[PDB]
Amino acid sequence: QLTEEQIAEFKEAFSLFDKDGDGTITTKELGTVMRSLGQNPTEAELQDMINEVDADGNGTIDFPEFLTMMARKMKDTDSEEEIREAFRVFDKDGNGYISAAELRHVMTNLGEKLTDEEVDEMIREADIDGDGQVNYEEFVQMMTA
Amino acid sequence: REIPLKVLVKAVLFACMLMRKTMASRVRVTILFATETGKSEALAWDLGALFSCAFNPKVVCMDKYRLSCLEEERLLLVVTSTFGNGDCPGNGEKLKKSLFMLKELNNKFRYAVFGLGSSMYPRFCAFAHDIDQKLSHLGASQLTPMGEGDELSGQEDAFRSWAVQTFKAACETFDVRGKQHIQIPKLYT
Ligand SMILES: Cc1cc2nc3c(=O)[nH]c(=O)nc-3n(C[C@H](O)[C@H](O)[C@H](O)COP(=O)(O)O)c2cc1C
Numbered sequence: 001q002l003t004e005e006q007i008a009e010f011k012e013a014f015s016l017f018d019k020d021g022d023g024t025i026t027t028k029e030l031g032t033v034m035r036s037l038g039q040n041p042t043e044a045e046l047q048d049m050i051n052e053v054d055a056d057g058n059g060t061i062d063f064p065e066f067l068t069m070m071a072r073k074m075k076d077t078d079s080e081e082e083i084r085e086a087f088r089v090f091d092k093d094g095n096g097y098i099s100a101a102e103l104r105h106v107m108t109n110l111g112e113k114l115t116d117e118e119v120d121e122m123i124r125e126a127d128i129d130g131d132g133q134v135n136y137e138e139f140v141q142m143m144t145a
Numbered sequence: 146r147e148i149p150l151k152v153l154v155k156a157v158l159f160a161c162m163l164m165r166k167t168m169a170s171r172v173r174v175t176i177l178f179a180t181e182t183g184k185s186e187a188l189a190w191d192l193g194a195l196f197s198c199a200f201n202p203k204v205v206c207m208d209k210y211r212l213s214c215l216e217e218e219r220l221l222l223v224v225t226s227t228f229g230n231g232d233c234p235g236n237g238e239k240l241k242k243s244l245f246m247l248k249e250l251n252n253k254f255r256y257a258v259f260g261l262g263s264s265m266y267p268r269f270c271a272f273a274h275d276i277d278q279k280l281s282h283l284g285a286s287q288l289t290p291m292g293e294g295d296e297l298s299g300q301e302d303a304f305r306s307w308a309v310q311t312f313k314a315a316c317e318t319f320d321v322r323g324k325q326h327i328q329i330p331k332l333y334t
Pocket residue numbers: 179180181182183184185186225226227228229230231232234261262263264266267268269270271296
């Protein structure tokens with residue numbers, strides 16, 4: 001598994017955390033995004049996470065450590081639940097559908113305020129049955145390409 | 146400007162894979178509630194929000210709780226009102242029958258209790274006091290003293306007061322790293 005396409009997406013995903021663009025993710029840059037997503041880890045837990053992915057034990061996470069992890073965790077079974085936990089982050093009402101607003105919400109929380117247009121397209125970017133929404137089936141199909 | 150959904154999704158999958166692990170390594174906490182008009186359940190899920198800042202809380206109605214569990218708990222929290230004459234709410238009689246039948250407990254876990262009541266009645270928060278007194282007898286260590294939210298004199302205020310104090314104590318007996326710096330909700334100031 002692992003096609004340059006997927007790797008390249010994981011790099012841009014990595015960048016989302018490495019906001020300052022130095023090539024490493026800090027315990028600080030991690031907390032910021034997790035709290036943006038409604039996750040509430042304690043400072044000591046933040047270092048745990050950083051320490052788990054940090055293979056060179058140098059204090060932070062570089063893309064390689066990020067790729068190393070995601071590539072492994074992806075091809076696994078736990079993904080089942082994890083991918084689903086990823087859905088909930090978006091589906092706040094747990095109605096089984098990620099509506100336009102919900103997607104807006106998360107983005108604005110990530111400090112990314114977009115017009116209602118680019119948001120509706122950011123959806124049809126995976127809306128199999130064109131219902132202007134992303135269900136679980138379409139969400140999981142979008143994670144595993 | 147912007148991040149393709151397929152990318153963002155991979156990033157949030159990264160965070161989720163991390164929270165899952167630190168969460169399963171936190172200490173489990175069981176929050177039991179019994180309620181007739183729903184005020185105990187609301188406070189119960191509020192207790193869960195506050196406890197989510199350091200622990201792995203679970204909110205569970207008294208009638209869906211299997212006593213067997215008492216033998217594996219680390220910390221049991223109870224939020225229930227009282228009725229009739231020291232009577233339990235509807236969804237609390239099943240557990241009531243049990244807890245008072247139970248003569249022994251090997252796992253001397255930690256527990257704290259908070260009951261909703263109303264000063265008007267002579268048997269104030271009697272059901273909450275009933276389970277609270279029963280647990281000490283059984284051997285469990287009272288984390289914090291039983292609280293009482295008087296329907297007439299600021300229930301929430303009392304709850305929140307007890308919620309926060311019971312939490313700062315839990316972060317203590319369980320050795321919670323960064324104890325004094327955990328950012329809790331805004332309502333508990
Ligand atoms: C018929 C009736 C009997 C009650 N008896 C008591 C009582 O003996 N002791 C007490 O502390 N509160 C008593 N209350 C007040 C409830 O404990 C209080 O209304 C509580 O807010 C309801 O909580 P809940 O929403 O969690 O069920 C009684 C209320 C009603 C309507």
